[PDB]
């Protein structure tokens, strides 16, 4: 840091600049940090009797952490539109981080009034691990983001983690991390903190949608030179006999043509409808779910593999867990009606990824003979096969930007299943805490742990700046594209704006896929 | 080679040196080489009536070969412990090979006595293919290793191979290799042989175990912002109606949370117990096995894909073939009791790879409607899907170090299924033979193949030195690790030591995974 | 992190054994307002895991 109590440690920077090829964004927010857990660590675990699936064991810490991982932190609704309408892809490159204008307040709750005053000599300490030595919590899509709207103020969320358990009990291999055991940087009023970071090379995210379905790749005018088996028998006299005929596949045969490629893999979902009348009356929620089984307990696959949500001309149906779901403004935690949630749509991927609610295809179950008749069965789960292409899941406007790839001997197509960018060395976790200030010890000496501290909290401003790389488009498409538009009719409230009471709200999910490409 | 009959061609080197980052090992053994097959090639094949699975066709040769491929050759039980306790991974780099102190003996069996004497002018010839032109036998985990204990003496195993067959009969494509048709190096007493080799780049083997299970990646304190479908219906009056409610997943919901990753693939096994009372009474061995079907015959998958052996708090069960199994000292070939075998345990991989005896998960089989009710089925086999992470199988103390990757147009995650390091250009096979010495031909000329030779054999010392690369650990774990310890109680015999009759024995399998890492 | 009280109301005092006591338990001395820092125990310096690249891996330390 630098200088005094009266001097300011940083300016407010929130802006976006568009350079053409690479583009830069900036934002600044205001935060407040409480003391958590009365300055002490605690182990936490599952509560008494619980399902074998719900057991957990871990620790909670006094430390907080910053999360900018959602897009809406970085991009405004309009800045989001020089991106998704005008471009075929984007990726991050490098970022900056800064804290400044730190001030610490102590509070006195005596009687029915609470007085608050500056504590000028108190400190707040911050570090960034950057060696990836801690359990990495970010990327699990928790709350506690920097707000989407720059004028809002937010608390910093508390930090904690989980470790191997057996039931509600720990195992010998289970690990315990003390955050005090790292070098950090102690800051007072008039001290600031910075670091900078560089993304590893990662593929552009695909903001295009395809103009060709994988099942139609070819010229309708010209027939193939390959033959397929067409008729298996022919009438002879009164009744048929076995005769094999072959054919070349034309535009009337398009079903039957040879191809060089296959659709992507599927792991199948249950289908439900937004119209309440079509759905069965029972509780199938947990029973009818698709799950995976790991170490004797069952977990839902909430996003699951990337698959189209519905087929043509059914907009009413979506996979049970297969989609992301966002809440509207002020929605509650539990048991809330469908009118409150916002359900995203995965469609444009129909052309490669198969629909999530249907089988991959059909396969032959048996060997035919004279007295046996051919039999097939549906394959509801398919792994990856050579010659198989697919697309990934869209990032939308608000959702995960990145995730940390687990450190393991093998992995396949690491792009993460919620969306965004898989990173082996992602942006490091930033951790922050209030330094404990003891209160009025006894006159005689005693060896005991202090239970008594001054009650205080801190606040300041944080800033983030990321540099993005863009991919422009050369398209010879003659006719116009599909663009993201706001409706021009009159309305009581404007979208993406404060209401009369001053609560900013986001009307609908906005994906990145509009501009079209050929497959 | 160099110099004389009286001069020695090499010193005994067996040692281990630890440099920190890289590390170097050395060993020397004493061998004896018989003449095989009376100096001639023979075709071999399956015997008369046999199962269609058991047919084979091939050749056996007079040549022998050296196999150091097991770890216990290179590492002593204590040297194995500055490795597995102190490190997160290791890989080979380069090796040396040497033969020396060669001496050839001829034997005379007349009457009831056998005299043995030096033959000073006889030769022994050796070559290393290194162009990978021969069938590559090593890596199939046969017998004939350099002994684990440096004072033992061993024969060199005989060399042979197999080729395409139809039943017990050869096919036109089947190949025949004459080892005489290579350049080799002929050695007498006072001649030595050397070559050196460099491993291609290969990933470190993972000697860590994970401190986090893949099903728990996230902060218990903070709720997600995503919604999952929670209740499918609500009571209305006397009976329920269809109503869809949604929820955000907290620490009580941990079963239901969204995740960016999925567990590794499985190919399922039958489960048996070490307690003899739980197992069914019948012969299910071959019938209840998991198999693959190639060209009309069936083969067991003995190791199979890497999967955890058992779940929490069942130590009694293991997959039917799914684990490696080692014999104790002096165990016989066939039909031996469980008390004689040593069964390895694959557990620490519970956190990623699914258990081998259970299904991967459940998937939805049908489309619901008003009068239809949701249906699911177990998926017992899963291929690789995008966003899937796993671990490989552990090497232990004694077992394959490497295998040769087959030469093919495609392969996936080549790490071999017994364990160790897949190599496209592995250490080349060393081949050795006694040169035939004819005996006393007839006085008149005859054109015929000699059936009569001097009876002789050779012996000497061999040496191997490998350089290893190590990966140290930076861990902020506060509490202690799990280490490999010998029990301190008194006992009749010390582990990994000679008994009163002088037979070295190994009490238990020792894996490499102790130190812990975060996932 | 430490906290330092004022001891003895900013003044020195002589202290000694209390009245009747065993001849073994008699003592005479002084107490001061001053405090002092003690790091002399190992567990201050070494964590349980750091203690294990030491005692398992080594024949001595100073
Ligand atoms: N986000 C992200 N990171 C890395 N790889 C990705 C990603 N998304 C898809 N893939 C695929 C496509 C790359 O060629 C391959 C490299 O994996 P590996 O060798 O890194 O993984
Ligand atoms: N032993 C071994 N050799 C090679 N690759 C391995 C091995 N074990 C795992 N893998 C995986 C991980 C590498 O990125 C990938 C390279 O395959 P390919 O392009 O060699 O294969």
Q: Which residues of B touch C (CB under 8 A)?
A: 82, 85-86, 475, 477-481, 483
Tell which one of A306, A413, A417, A424 to mutate to probe ligand 1, the residue whose CB is within 8 A of the most ligand atoms: A413
Strand partners, A227: A248
First and final C-alpha spacing in chain A: 53
Resolution of the experimental structure, in angstroms: 2.8
Is the sign of the CA dihedral A76, A81, A87, A89 positive or negative?
positive
Distance A200 CA to ligand 1 centre (A): 11
Burial of B251 (0-12, 13-18, 19+ CB in 10 A): buried
**Which residues on chain C are in Cβ contact (under 8 Å) with A438?**
1, 3
Instruction: Report yes or no: A214 and A389 within 8 Å, Cβ to Cβ.
Output: yes
CATH 3.90.940.20 is held by the domain A3-519: no
Instruction: List phi, psi (to 5°) of B481.
Output: -85, 180
Q: Whose CA is nearest to atom 3 of ligand 1?
A: A422
Residue closest via CA to ligand 2's atom 5 equals: B414
List strand residue ranges (DSSP E) for B325-441, in order.
325-327, 341-343, 361-364, 376-379, 381-382, 388-390, 402-404, 421-423, 430-434
Q: Within 10 Å of residue A370's Cβ, how many Cβ atoms?
A: 6
Q: Is A403 helix (H, G, I), strand (E, B) or coil?
A: strand
DSSP class of residue B252 equals: S
Cβ neighbours of residue A201 under 8 Å, at least 6 residues apart?
none
| Distance (Å) from CA B414 to ligand 2 centroid | 5
Q: Which residues of B touch A336 (CB under 8 A)?
A: 227, 245-247
CB contact under 8 A, B229 and A285: yes
Buried/exposed A384-401: b ≥16 CB within 10 Å, e otherwise: beeeeebbbbbbbbbbbb
DSSP single-letter state for residue B37: G
Give the integer Cα–Cα distance in Å for B437 and A388. Answer: 61
CB–CB of C49 and B479 under 8 A? yes
Chain C residue nearest residue B485, CA to CA: C56
| Residue of B395, B415, B426 best suited for mutating to test ligand 2, as the one with most atoms within 8 Å of CB | B415
Chain A: closest CA distance from residue C40 (Å): 16
Q: Which residues line ligand 1 (CB under 6 A)?
A: A 202-203, 413-415, 421-422
DSSP classification of residue B379? E
Q: Is A57 exposed, middle or buried (0-12, 13-18, 19+ CB in 10 A)?
A: buried
| Of A30, A151, A197, A154, residue with least CA distance to A100 | A30
Dist. CA B4–CA B15, nearest whole Å: 28
Judging contacts by C-beta atoms under 8 Å, the chain B residues touching residue C48 are: 478-480
Question: Are C9 and C31 spatial neighbours (Cβ–Cβ below 8 Å)?
Answer: no
CA of residue A25 to ligand 1 center, whole Å: 25
- Residue carrying structure tokens 């570090």: A127
C-alpha to C-alpha distances, B154 to A390, B66, B145, nearest whole angstrom: 56, 11, 8
Choose the closest CB to A142 out of B222, B247, B384. B222
Experimental method: cryo-EM
* A-chain residue closest to C10, CA distance: A443
Is residue B27 packed enough to be buried (19+ CB in 10 Å), middle (13-18) or exposed (0-12)?
Answer: buried
C-alpha distance from residue B152 to each of B13, B31, B149, B503, B504 (Å): 15, 9, 6, 9, 9
* B71: enclosing H helix or E strand: helix B71-74
User: Can you say whether the dihedral through the CA atoms of B474, B475, B479, B481 is positive or negative?
Assistant: negative
Three-class secondary structure of residue A26 per DSSP? strand
Distance (Å) from CA B91 to ligand 2 centroid: 13
What separation in angstroms does the CA of B321 have from each of A285, A401, B268, B500?
37, 43, 10, 36
Q: How far are the Cα atoms of A161, B2, B85, B517 from residue B312, in angstroms, in the given order? A: 21, 62, 24, 20
**Would the CA dihedral through A51, A57, A60, A66 be positive or negative?**
negative
């Amino acid at each position: 840091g630098a200088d005094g109590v009266g001097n300011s440690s940083g300016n407010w920077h929130c802006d976006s600049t568009w350079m053409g090829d690479r583009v830069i964004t900036t934002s600044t927010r205001t935060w407040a940090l409480p003391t958590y857990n009365n300055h002490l660590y605690k182990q936490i675990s599952s509560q008494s009797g619980a399902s074998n699936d719900n057991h957990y064991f871990g620790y909670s810490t006094p430390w907080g952490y910053f999360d900018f991982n959602r897009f809406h932190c970085h991009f405004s609704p309009r800045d989001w539109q020089r991106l998704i309408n005008n471009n075929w892809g984007f990726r991050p490159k490098r970022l900056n981080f800064k804290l400044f204008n730190i001030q610490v307040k102590e509070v006195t709750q005596n009687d029915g009034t609470t007085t608050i005053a500056n504590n000028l000599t108190s400190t707040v300490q911050v570090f960034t691990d950057s060696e990836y030595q801690l359990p990495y919590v970010l990327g699990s899509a928790h709350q506690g983001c920097l707000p989407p709207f720059p004028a809002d103020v937010f608390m910093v969320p508390q930090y904690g983690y989980l470790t191997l358990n057996n039931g509600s009990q720990a195992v010998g291999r289970s690990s315990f991390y003390c955050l005090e055991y790292f070098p950090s940087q102690m800051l007072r009023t008039g001290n600031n903190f910075t670091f900078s970071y560089t993304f590893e090379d990662v593929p552009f995210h695909s903001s295009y949608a395809h103009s060709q379905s994988l099942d139609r790749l070819m010229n309708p005018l010209i027939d193939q030179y390959l033959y397929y088996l067409s008729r298996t028998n022919t009438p002879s006299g009164t009744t048929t006999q076995s005769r094999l005929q072959f054919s070349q596949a034309g535009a009337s045969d398009i079903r039957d043509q040879s191809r060089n490629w296959l659709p992507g893999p599927c792991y199948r979902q249950q289908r439900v409808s937004k119209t309440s009348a079509d759905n069965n009356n029972s509780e199938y929620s947990w029973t009818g779910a698709t799950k995976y089984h790991l170490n004797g307990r069952d977990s839902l696959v909430n996003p699951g593999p990337a698959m189209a949500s519905h087929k043509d001309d059914e907009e009413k149906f979506f996979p049970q867990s297969g989609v992301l779901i966002f809440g509207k403004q002020g929605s509650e935690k539990t048991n809330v009606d469908i009118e409150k949630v916002m359900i995203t749509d995965e469609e444009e991927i129909r052309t490669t990824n198969p629909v999530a609610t249907e089988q991959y295809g059909s396969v032959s179950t048996n060997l035919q003979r004279g007295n046996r008749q051919a039999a097939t069965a549906d394959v509801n789960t398919q792994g990856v096969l050579p010659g198989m292409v697919w697309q990934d899941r869209d990032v939308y406007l608000q959702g995960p930007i990145w995730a940390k790839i687990p450190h393991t001997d093998g992995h396949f197509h690491p792009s993460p299943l919620m969306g965004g960018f898989g990173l082996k060395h992602p942006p490091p976790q930033i951790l922050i805490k209030n330094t404990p200030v003891p209160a009025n010890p006894s006159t005689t000496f005693s060896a005991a742990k202090f239970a008594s501290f001054i009650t205080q909290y801190s606040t300041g401003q944080v800033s983030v700046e990321i540099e993005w790389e863009l991919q422009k488009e050369n398209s010879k498409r003659w006719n116009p594209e599909i663009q993201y538009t706001s409706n021009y009719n009159k309305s009581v409230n404007v979208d993406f704006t404060v209401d009369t009471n001053g609560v900013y709200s986001e009307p609908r999910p906005i994906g990145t896929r509009y501009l079209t490409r050929n497959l």
